[PDB]
Amino acid sequence: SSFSGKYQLQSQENFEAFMKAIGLPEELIQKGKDIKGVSEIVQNGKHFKFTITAGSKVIQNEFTVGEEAEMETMTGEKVKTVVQLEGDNKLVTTFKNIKSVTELNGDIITNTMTLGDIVFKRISKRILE
Amino acid sequence: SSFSGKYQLQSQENFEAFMKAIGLPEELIQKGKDIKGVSEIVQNGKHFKFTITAGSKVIQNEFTVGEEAEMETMTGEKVKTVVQLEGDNKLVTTFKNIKSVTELNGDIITNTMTLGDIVFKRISKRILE
Ligand SMILES: CCCCCCCCCCCCCCCC(=O)O
Numbered sequence: 647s648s649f650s651g652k653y654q655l656q657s658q659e660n661f662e663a664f665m666k667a668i669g670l671p672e673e674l675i676q677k678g679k680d681i682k683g684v685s686e687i688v689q690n691g692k693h694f695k696f697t698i699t700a701g702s703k704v705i706q707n708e709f710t711v712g713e714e715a716e717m718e719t720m721t722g723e724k725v726k727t728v729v730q731l732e733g734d735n736k737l738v739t740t741f742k743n744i745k746s747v748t749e750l751n752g753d754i755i756t757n758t759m760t761l762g763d764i765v766f767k768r769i770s771k772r773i774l775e
Numbered sequence: 776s777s778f779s780g781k782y783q784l785q786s787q788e789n790f791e792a793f794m795k796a797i798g799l800p801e802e803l804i805q806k807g808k809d810i811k812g813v814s815e816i817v818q819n820g821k822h823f824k825f826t827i828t829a830g831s832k833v834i835q836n837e838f839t840v841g842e843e844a845e846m847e848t849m850t851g852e853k854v855k856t857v858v859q860l861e862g863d864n865k866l867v868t869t870f871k872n873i874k875s876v877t878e879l880n881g882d883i884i885t886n887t888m889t890l891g892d893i894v895f896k897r898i899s900k901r902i903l904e
């Protein structure tokens with residue numbers, strides 16, 4: 647019902663392949679590929695504040711679902727996109743050629759980003775505080 | 776008696792001045808100055824592993840107190856230094872013209888980095904898992 651929490655990355659698949667596909671340099675990818683950090687979400691109804699840690703980068707994004715917003719991506723590009731809430735537990739959007747689904751089941755977020763044949767999946771667990 | 780934990784940045788002083796002094800690109804200073812994320816320490820005796828969130832960057836470092844080590848700074852530069860334990864609750868390192876003191880007070884960690892007349896101070900709080 648609420649996405650709010652601090653989420654510890656537990657495991658991921660295809661980090662290197664996805665970051666290569668979007669244009670990041672190999673040297674940066676290899677430096678970040680094994681980091682398992684903590685991302686944070688604060689949800690207030692349709693409003694979301696994200697402090698995402700992925701690889702060696704921390705990205706802070708904010709949106710209201712259903713409203714267009716500029717989302718900073720791993721390349722540094724700020725993309726214009728609309729994120730929708732499906733049900734109470736799935737955030738969906740598409741930007742460039744990437745389909746993104748952020749799904750909350752209990753205390754586990756599964757984030758799936760699909761770019762052609764590459765399915766980049768991150769599993770993170772809410773720190774219960 | 777253990778530094779181990781995940782710590783949420785609560786407040787900080789003179790981020791912009793310190794990052795300017797060490798030469799961080801201005802675009803990264805402006806992006807990173809308001810980000811308050813989670814850093815992790817794993818201590819095993821004199822050995823420490825760090826996953827540090829500072830601004831828009833995540834930095835991993837690892838060393839044994841009392842032994843020379845090579846640590847990655849906020850600019851990405853690698854420096855060789857020996858980290859000491861002071862008074863059983865302070866990690867103290869001096870590299871180039873910076874003195875860094877990481878002090879543990881219960882659930883609070885205070886990182887104080889002194890560079891000439893600038894004191895960059897971070898106060899973080901243990902996440903209770
Ligand atoms: C345009 C959207 C932002 C894209 C940023 C790319 C970094 C990977 C995104 C995964 C974060 C999704 C939130 C779940 C928590 C997590 O997996 O850290």
Ligand SMILES: CCCCCCCCCCCCCCCC(=O)O
Pocket residue numbers: 782784814827828829834846847848849877884885886897898899
């Ligand atoms: C050897 C230099 C360390 C990395 C340089 C980044 C500047 C900030 C370092 C602060 C790390 C201290 C660890 C405790 C938690 C924190 O304050 O984030």
